[PDB]
Motif scaffolding. Structure first.
Motif, short mmCIF file in Angstrom:
data_model
loop_
_atom_site.label_atom_id
_atom_site.label_comp_id
_atom_site.label_asym_id
_atom_site.label_seq_id
_atom_site.Cartn_x
_atom_site.Cartn_y
_atom_site.Cartn_z
N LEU A 103 -2.78 -14.25 -61.90
CA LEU A 103 -3.21 -15.65 -61.89
C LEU A 103 -4.40 -15.97 -62.77
O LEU A 103 -4.65 -17.15 -63.02
N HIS A 104 -5.16 -14.98 -63.21
CA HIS A 104 -6.36 -15.33 -63.96
C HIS A 104 -6.57 -14.40 -65.14
O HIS A 104 -7.51 -14.58 -65.92
N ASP A 147 5.29 -19.65 -63.76
CA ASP A 147 5.35 -19.31 -62.35
C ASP A 147 6.27 -18.11 -62.19
O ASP A 147 7.29 -18.01 -62.88
N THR A 193 3.52 -17.49 -58.03
CA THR A 193 2.13 -17.44 -58.46
C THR A 193 1.73 -18.76 -59.11
O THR A 193 1.46 -18.85 -60.31
N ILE A 194 1.71 -19.82 -58.30
CA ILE A 194 1.54 -21.17 -58.83
C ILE A 194 0.20 -21.77 -58.42
O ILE A 194 -0.46 -21.28 -57.50
N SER A 195 -0.20 -22.84 -59.11
CA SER A 195 -1.43 -23.58 -58.82
C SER A 195 -1.36 -25.00 -59.37
O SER A 195 -1.46 -25.20 -60.58
N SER A 245 -2.16 -20.39 -66.25
CA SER A 245 -1.31 -21.55 -66.09
C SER A 245 -0.19 -21.61 -67.12
O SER A 245 0.24 -22.70 -67.48
#
Lengths: 174, 64
Positions: free
Chosen positions: A99-100, A108, A157-159, A105
């Motif tokens: 995720l980072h 997914d 693995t979404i945001s 971003s």
């Protein structure tokens, strides 16, 4: 660091991320998959008298968007690591490494697993019942040997979000 | 037919006979509600067939 220097790349780095963290486990990637919903807020298949459009937007009531939701399977054969991928163990290792660090971003990611039958108990209290969404490993009181099965799902693995709101001001008149 | 409704408190392994015997009890309870007033068993609500297939003989149902 060698993999994280090429820009906009890649899919094959996700094989290295798994083989590093727990050997005995292999990885395969399917690049496109049949994703679903996002439900569009006007249904838009009202047939209009004053003004309507055709060219691209043609559908029913729910849309399908393939474009970015890859499928990942894992395959273990040591039972000490089977209890590492269920949430609490090594699942916190991948979930922060993606995720980072490597993706962010961009996309997914969907997870999946295939083992032999399970090692999973039942309806005990507050928190560790669920083997993801499904339950098994409790009923075979019949036969000695193996059957292969898919295991479960893990979350994306979404945001994302919308924040709430409407606006009050504007850019510039040039 | 020896209907056994289970109980769950803690630590019970799930197994299909808790669920199968549960759902059979709800039918038998709903049966005993109807037999209070009417004293009638069940019957036929609607049964409509297809008339066009009869002289070429078969028989098809539509709603049963």
């Amino acid at each position: 660091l060698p993999l994280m220097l090429l820009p906009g790349r890649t899919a094959e780095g996700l094989t290295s991320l798994v083989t590093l963290l727990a050997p005995g486990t292999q990885a395969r990637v399917w690049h496109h998959d049949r994703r679903r919903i996002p439900l569009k807020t006007p249904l838009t298949m009202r047939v209009h008298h004053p003004v309507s459009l055709k060219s691209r937007p043609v559908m029913g009531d729910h849309a399908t968007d393939v474009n970015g939701q890859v499928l990942l399977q894992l395959s273990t054969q040591t039972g000490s690591e089977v209890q590492g991928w269920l949430p609490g163990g090594h699942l916190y290792s991948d979930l922060l490494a993606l995720l980072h660090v490597y993706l962010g971003s961009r996309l997914d990611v969907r997870l999946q697993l295939c083992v032999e039958r399970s090692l999973l108990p039942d309806a005990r209290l507050s928190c560790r019942p669920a083997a993801g969404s499904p339950q098994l490993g409790r009923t075979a009181v019949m036969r000695t040997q193996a059957k292969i099965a898919t295991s479960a799902a893990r979350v994306m693995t979404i945001s994302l979000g919308r924040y709430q709101r409407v606006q009050e001001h504007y850019q510039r008149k040039e | 037919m020896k209907i056994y409704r289970p109980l769950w408190e803690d630590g019970a392994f799930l197994m299909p006979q808790q669920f199968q015997q549960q759902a059979a009890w709800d039918v038998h309870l709903a049966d005993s509600v109807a037999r209070m007033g009417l004293a009638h068993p069940w019957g036929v609500v609607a049964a409509e067939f297809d008339d066009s297939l009869l002289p070429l003989s078969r028989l098809n149902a539509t709603r049963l």
